[PDB]
Every structure is written in C-alpha cells, then in structure tokens.
C-alpha cells in the first residue's frame, strides 16, 4: 500500500544514588515514536509511426 509505518525507540531510562541508606528514591519512564516509508512512480512513453513498424 501507499505508505508503511515503523515504530522506533526515542528516550531511555536513567539511574541514581540516594543520600545515605534511608534517602528517598526517584522516577523514570521510557518512550517510543514513529517513522515512515512512502511510494512514488517512474514512467516513460515512446511513440512511433505505424508505417515504420511494418
């Protein structure tokens, strides 16, 4: 068909230290997005006189 979609990764998690053995922990979330391929067309046309073909 005229177009097709690829999903792709777009951001990454990270990690942390905490302040001593009792410090408050921290948050992260991963993400994705899209990329596309799409279609186009080539043509040519060739004329000739009917007598030449005979």
């Amino acid at each position: 068909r005229n177009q097709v979609r690829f999903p792709v990764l777009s951001a990454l998690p990270v990690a942390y230290w905490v302040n001593g053995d009792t410090g408050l922990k921290q948050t992260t979330e991963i993400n994705w997005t899209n990329k596309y391929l799409n279609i186009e067309e080539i043509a040519t046309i060739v004329p000739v006189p009917d007598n030449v073909l005979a």
Binding site: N19, G20, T22, G23, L24
Partner: protein, 124 residues
C-alpha cells in the same frame, strides 16, 4: 555517649516565683515532659508541662520562691517513649530519619561523611 533514658536524674535549677524554670546548658531535653519535679520552693506533685530549650521549661504549678537549688526529676513508665531502658541516640539525633528531615538534608548521626574515617561503636 549520653543517649536517652526512662530512669530519673538530679539537676540544678533556678525558679522564678511563677510556672517558669531555668538552668544550665543541657539541663532539660524534649522527652522530659510529663516527669515529676521535687525541689524546695515547689508544691507537692508538680510536673514538667512543657520544655522550650536546653536551659528552660514550664511546670504545672507556680513556684513559691525565687532561688537556685538541686532538684530531682522522676522516672516514667515508658508509654511516652517506645523504649523502657537506655539507647545510644539522644532526642535530637533520634529525629533525623523522617521524610521531612530527609528533604531538609540533615545528616544522620552515623552517615560516614569522609572517605577515610572508620565506623565505630558507641558506649554508655
């Protein structure tokens, strides 16, 4: 090395002729509220009703005289603290572990602050 305890202690304290008591540095601490206090110039059954600093506190009745003297602070049954014995943590450093204190960035009494110091045991 001083920590917390339920058992009583003796202290030197100054009376104003009202509900106010004062004394030297470290004579009072936050856990003392609800203890009995027995001194000359103090009416019978008097208790610590509030504490305001290491040097000052409030009592349930007016002192009858203004003077400085030795005085006795009573023991208590261990309802107003979880502990019945003694613990190495004092009242202030025992407070350090809350979420609010953790946000304020206050160091615990045992956060090893330098790369080359040893960990060490406390004693009485």
């Amino acid at each position: 090395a001083t920590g917390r305890t339920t058992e009583g202690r003796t202290v030197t304290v100054t009376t104003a002729s009202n509900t106010t008591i004062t004394g030297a540095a470290g004579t009072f601490v936050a856990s003392d509220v609800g203890r009995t206090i027995t001194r000359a110039g103090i009416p019978a059954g008097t208790t610590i009703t509030a504490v305001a600093s290491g040097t000052s506190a409030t009592i349930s009745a007016a002192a009858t005289t203004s003077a400085t003297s030795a005085a006795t602070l009573g023991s208590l049954n261990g309802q107003s603290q979880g502990l019945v014995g003694w613990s190495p943590e004092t009242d202030t450093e025992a407070g350090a572990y809350s979420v609010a204190a953790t946000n304020a960035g206050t160091v615990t009494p045992d956060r090893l602050t330098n790369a080359f110091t040893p960990v060490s045991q406390r004693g009485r």
